Structure 1
Amino acid sequence: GHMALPKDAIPSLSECQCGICMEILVEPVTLPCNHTLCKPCFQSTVEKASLCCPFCRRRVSSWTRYHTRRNSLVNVELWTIIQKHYPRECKLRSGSGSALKRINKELSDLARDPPAQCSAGPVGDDMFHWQATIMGPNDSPYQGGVFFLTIHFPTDYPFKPPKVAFTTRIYHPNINSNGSICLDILRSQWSPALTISKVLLSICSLLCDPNPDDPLVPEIARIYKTDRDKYNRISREWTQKYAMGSRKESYSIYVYKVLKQVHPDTGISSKAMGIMNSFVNDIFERIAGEASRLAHYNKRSTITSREIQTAVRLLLPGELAKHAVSEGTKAVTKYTSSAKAKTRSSRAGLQFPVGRVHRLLRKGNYSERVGAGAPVYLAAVLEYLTAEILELAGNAARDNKKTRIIPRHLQLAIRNDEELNKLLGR
């Protein structure tokens, strides 16, 4: 064999991607500065144009001349490693380097491996104009909020940075009232190899740990430095007011994702979202409480998916119970028959958070132990009920010639549906 690496040091697939086109490196060309790009990108952006490294701008015209003559451009050692360990991706692989193709590849990459607690895509058939959704991290006063952002890609992307700004009002020392963001990755530390995913992850990290010494809003930075408790309080209050936060547990991001499944071209107002959140918290409390009592009455230390199933039948009207039971069972069987995945929800095929529901079931002191199937089942039931409610309310907004769901549409859809009225009458 030409060579081999220690198992520890075999590069991942993502570490084998071309920093310019975001496709797997094929015939990787490593420049004398030790920056690498795939040969098609080398041809389109170096050999045919500037004769400079796209990453560090070092001139490589002499190097190119020498190695083009000898057909020694390719880093054969790297090339062998990549072919041996990712042969299928190599085989599937001035066209390269084009901005439109790079943005499309990043979009696909988001579909296959979406970033933790984020999401982004084109707003309306213009690939250079995206909307992004971030959820407030749990280690931050923004927990439970849904922050929307805009992303404008420049025509020379990825060589110039994307333009990213919050559309959702937020109380942050590095984010101003227009939504502009002071973050190194967007300007001083931008690199063609960086992606929208890494930017969204860098923003989430900024929400967790602001930088008060380089602020866009000096008053907020001063408060963060002097009265951190006041900063956290105002941050939380703004999250509730503008980012669909909640005094209780928040499900807003998951409600929104479900809404985009059943009615993609339909929105929801913060007040209607607050109602959805009350529903989910009520269904959770009722099911979890009944499941607590079922385990206790039957001298069982553990709440499993069986107590959740029985609680569902006791609490929901007939047709809703049967469908909820079917969805909860489908999720548990899919989960147990699937490999461990990035999120437990993804393993279960759900939008609602299985890991969070499990934590809540144990934090609520409902029982000594909580089996792994219970949160899968419960989360699927909350998702099913959310999906049925939103489908009706969306249908009602369409009949009222409205593009956004409001509390009136929610109240209409629940009063007109007999079983939902019984369940959520209050």
Structure 2
Amino acid sequence: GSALKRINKELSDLARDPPAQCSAGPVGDDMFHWQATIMGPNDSPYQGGVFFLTIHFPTDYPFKPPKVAFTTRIYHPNINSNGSIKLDILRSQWSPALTISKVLLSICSLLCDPNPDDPLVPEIARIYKTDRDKYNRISREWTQKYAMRKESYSIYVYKVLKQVHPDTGISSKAMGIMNSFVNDIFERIAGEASRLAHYNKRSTITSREIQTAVRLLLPGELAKHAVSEGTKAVTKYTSSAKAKTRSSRAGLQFPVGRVHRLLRKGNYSERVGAGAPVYLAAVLEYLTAEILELAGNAARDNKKTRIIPRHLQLAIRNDEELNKLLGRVTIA
């Protein structure tokens, strides 16, 4: 679609020469929903703070303006508690010629030079005009008080397979599918968790939002066992000593740090608790163990010692719950 491609080009343009004091990227695999971070302009009382914004592209982009709003509380004549930004380009003076990079730069200038004559919060716009010292001081108070290549898991898939079926291998084509399953589950769970975080106005994704997403997106026994594996992992991670590896502290084969990084890298939320990646990592490992156990069992009926894409198709189709989860994923 034109909207998508236009969005993808701006990202490419933004990626090469990012805007000063700014950065933006999609949320998960959703190109129509971005997260943006602005470093406190040096020529402003907001210096030192990191402000988080949300961006939503309409279907008719670039012929319609993007919906931009602050998720971090800020004190400004043109920004209200809803994060709404009164800026001419955002609504009145939209043009397809503008870019998200230009928008963000126009917002930065707005923080350096407010427009108190066309205000969104009158009290702030009055304090700004009559007592600039009071405005600058409160701004810093708020700044201080509020603004402070598909992934591959071949090793861990291999490690789980060695636990479940020590004498069964997996072809390269079968391993690629595994990576597709793990990445899809990651995207869908994280995506939902992000939704829940924004929905309830939470700046940190914790194991709480990871569990609710699992309980909602996984069917029947898969969800019940998944929730059990995620809980057992988070319990072991808290009690276990700090000296050993995050994955080891949770008794998992999958990498917590990598998941934790991806949780941040994906812009699913402003922050990500330390429990969240453990929970998701445990959930990812369990499903991998389930899929690999069935596939290997499938490779055995045909007297094969190496899982191939066919045995993966079979293991999913033979299990009602898994097929409900992995039906859409392609299997060549």
TM-score, normalisation: structure 2: 0.55
Write out per-residue CA displacement over residues 113-146 of structure 1, whole angstroms, 9 at most, x where no aligned residue.
9999999999999999999999999999999999
CA contact (8 A) 1:397 1:405 kept: yes
CA contact (8 A) 2:299 2:306 kept: yes
Distance 1:425 1:289, change over 3 A: same
Distance 1:401 1:239 in 2: 65
Larger CA deviation: 124-133 vs 288-297: 124-133
Distance 2:169 2:133 in 1: 34
CA contact (8 A) 1:269 1:406 kept: yes
Distance 2:49 2:162 in 1: 17
Deviation at 1:318, TM superposition (A): 1.1
Distance 1:190 1:419, change over 3 A: closer
Deviation at 1:349, TM superposition (A): 0.4
CA contact (8 A) 1:120 1:130 kept: yes
Write out per-residue CA displacement over residues 159-212 of structure 1, whole angstroms, 9 at most, x where no aligned residue.
999999999999999999999999999999999999999999999999999999
Distance 2:58 2:109 in 1: 24
Deviation at 1:342, TM superposition (A): 3.4
Distance 1:157 1:226, change over 3 A: same
Distance 1:368 1:136, change over 3 A: closer
Write out per-residue CA displacement over residues 82-139 of structure 1, whole angstroms, 9 at most, x where no aligned residue.
xxxxxxxxxxxxxxx9999999999999999999999999999999999999999999
Distance 1:421 1:404 in 2: 22
Distance 1:358 1:156, change over 3 A: closer
Q: Secondary structure at the match of 2:81?
A: coil
Distance 1:154 1:377, change over 3 A: closer
Deviation at 1:341, TM superposition (A): 3.3
Distance 1:159 1:379, change over 3 A: same
Distance 1:419 1:216, change over 3 A: same
CA contact (8 A) 1:249 1:281 kept: yes
Distance 1:199 1:269, change over 3 A: farther
Q: Secondary structure at the match of 2:36?
A: strand
Distance 2:211 2:218 in 1: 11
Ranked by relative contact order (alpha carbons within 8 Å, sequence separation 6 or more), the top structure is: 2
Residue 364 of structure 1 corresponds to 266
Distance 1:217 1:301, change over 3 A: closer
Distance 1:343 1:152, change over 3 A: farther
Match of 1:217 among 116, 121, 137: 121
Q: Does 2:28 match 1:145?
A: no
CA contact (8 A) 2:26 2:266 kept: no
Q: Secondary structure at the match of 2:55?
A: strand
Distance 1:376 1:398, change over 3 A: same
Distance 1:396 1:412 in 2: 7
Larger CA deviation: 321-330 vs 157-166: 157-166
Distance 2:300 2:125 in 1: 44
TM-score, normalisation: structure 1: 0.43
Return the index of the structure with the highest Cα Rg: 1
Larger CA deviation: 165-174 vs 372-381: 165-174
Deviation at 1:237, TM superposition (A): 51
Q: Secondary structure at the match of 1:128?
A: strand
Structure 1 vs Structure 2: percent identity of aligned residues? 100
CA contact (8 A) 1:144 1:249 kept: no
Distance 1:228 1:272 in 2: 65
Write out per-residue CA displacement over residues 221-253 of structure 1, whole angstroms, 9 at most, x where no aligned residue.
999999999999999999999999xx3001111
Distance 1:116 1:317, change over 3 A: farther
Alpha-carbon RMSD across the aligned residues, in angstroms, is: 18.3
CA contact (8 A) 1:173 1:220 kept: yes
* Structure 1, unaligned runs of 5 or more: 1-96
Write out per-residue CA displacement over residues 306-338 of structure 1, whole angstroms, 9 at most, x where no aligned residue.
000000011100110000000000000000000
Distance 1:286 1:243, change over 3 A: same
Deviation at 1:409, TM superposition (A): 0.4
Distance 1:371 1:191 in 2: 39
* Structure 2, unaligned runs of 5 or more: none
Distance 1:300 1:211, change over 3 A: closer
Distance 2:30 2:200 in 1: 59
CA contact (8 A) 1:393 1:410 kept: yes
CA contact (8 A) 1:120 1:131 kept: yes
Residue correspondence of structure 1 range 243-322 to structure 2 within 5 A: 247-322=149-224
Larger CA deviation: 140-149 vs 279-288: 140-149
